[PDB]
Design a protein around this ligand. Structure first.
Ligand code: HEM
Ligand code: MG
Length: 391
């Protein structure tokens, strides 16, 4: 018997209360069975890093189902190394800067332009969502007239990865996947005679450089599923961090090149990634508790961020902290391959929003709530981001 607690149902109006709560609980026990999640959880940063380091004992087997079967994150050993090299090549710094100029800036400009005559915004709906809706179709040569349809298809895929059990929902994921696959096949087949300038174009060419033909559609769908919702929760909590710290927002105006390190601090102070899951391949012990072969284990990617031994005054948002060793993108073998795109999109989007709305600030009349199921999503974050845009 693990000790048992219910820490993930915690809600609050204070964005830092949950990380405080987890770090307090971790002082009491690192490993505990969370009755709200239904699984054992590892809290302490050192235990989480240790689990992530030992991929042979703690695998990604639980992910290897439905539309995720055989995908990058499910892979270990040599299989992962080979496929990971392909992904790394299509998200390298040259590619990131290329798509900064060709795709993300134009999209960010359009998104921000829409707000220009308005007095208020709810920046989750009006920015955090809008960014990846525009960026994903543009990156992958998907038609503008299908953006809503494809949003619904992707949300259905994502639902199926969250509800691996339910065979109707999985079945709906599977169908949505096949419609996306058909659009993306059609686009990928055109690349042979008419190579494009899109990212889906660089992928089709990288598949050949590694001698694969691994489907182009496959790579693209992995990137879509890994970015489409994550991006919105990262943007959402960046905006929270900025709008909640008018002293910091003042410093950023004075010195715009501080934005990247401000982003790094937003990801420590208010990470959107609550946790990830591992499969215990052979009995092991972590923080003194025994974990039977076959256990499904949840790793907190937040508690480390609030451990005062690692980050002093962790409750305080400091844009000069320059923190490292955050867990928001994971650690080890499966460390997020998309992190360069996420960082860039956050920087580009937010810089454009800030420069366009000198008066941008929190709206004092609405009290967002923070939870680990905001609007049902698998994230940590606010239910809305009410802002004032004028004077
Ligand atoms: C915006 C914020 C993002 C966050 C917070 C996030 C977080 C994560 C985390 C925690 C993992 C590790 C999963 C595990 O170890 O179980 C991961 C892996 C991954 N992420 Fe992200 N990510 C984000 C953006 C993206 C983007 C933009 C892409 C695609 C462009 C993407 C694609 C992936 C892929 C493919 C993997 C698997 C990597 C591997 O197994 O080698 N992510 N991400
Ligand atoms: Mg790091």
């Amino acid at each position: 018997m693990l000790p048992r607690k219910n820490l993930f149902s915690f809600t609050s109006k204070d964005p830092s209360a949950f990380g405080i709560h987890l770090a307090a609980a971790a002082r009491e026990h690192s490993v505990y069975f969370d009755e709200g999640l239904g699984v054992p959880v590892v809290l302490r940063g050192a235990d989480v890093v240790a689990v992530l380091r030992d991929s042979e004992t703690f695998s990604t087997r639980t992910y290897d189902t439905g539309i995720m079967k055989g995908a990058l994150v499910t892979l270990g050993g040599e299989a992962h190394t080979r496929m990971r090299r392909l992904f790394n090549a299509v998200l390298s710094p040259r590619v990131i800067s290329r798509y900064e100029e060709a795709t993300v800036t134009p999209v960010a400009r359009r998104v921000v332009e829409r707000l220009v005559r308005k007095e208020r915004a709810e920046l989750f709906d009006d920015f955090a969502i809008s960014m990846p809706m525009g960026v994903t179709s543009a990156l992958f040569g998907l038609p503008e007239e299908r953006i809503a349809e494809n949003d619904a298809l992707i949300r259905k895929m994502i639902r199926s990865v969250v509800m691996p059990q339910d065979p109707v929902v999985v079945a709906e994921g599977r169908s949505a996947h096949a419609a996306m696959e058909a659009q993306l096949r059609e686009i990928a087949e055109r690349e042979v005679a008419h190579p494009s300038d899109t990212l889906l174009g660089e992928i089709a060419r990288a598949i050949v450089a590694e001698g694969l033909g691994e489907a182009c559609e496959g790579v693209v769908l992995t990137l879509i599923l890994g970015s489409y919702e994550t991006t919105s929760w990262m943007l959402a909590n960046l905006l929270v961090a900025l709008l909640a710290h008018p002293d910091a927002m003042n410093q950023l105006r004075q010195q715009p090149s501080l934005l990247p390190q401000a982003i790094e601090e937003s990801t420590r102070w208010c990470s959107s990634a609550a946790g990830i899951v591992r499969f215990v391949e052979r009995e092991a012990t972590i923080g003194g508790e025994t974990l039977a072969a076959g256990t499904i284990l949840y790793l907190s990617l937040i508690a480390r961020h609030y451990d005062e031994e690692i980050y002093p005054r962790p409750e305080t948002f400091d844009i000069h902290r320059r923190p490292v060793g955050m867990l928001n993108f994971g650690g080890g073998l499966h460390y997020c391959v998309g992190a360069p795109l996420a960082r860039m999109e956050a920087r580009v989007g937010v810089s454009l929003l800030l420069e366009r709305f000198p008066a941008l600030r929190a709206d004092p009349t609405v009290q967002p709530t923070f939870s680990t199921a905001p609007r049902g999503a698998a994230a940590f974050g606010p239910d809305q981001i009410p802002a004032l845009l004028v004077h």
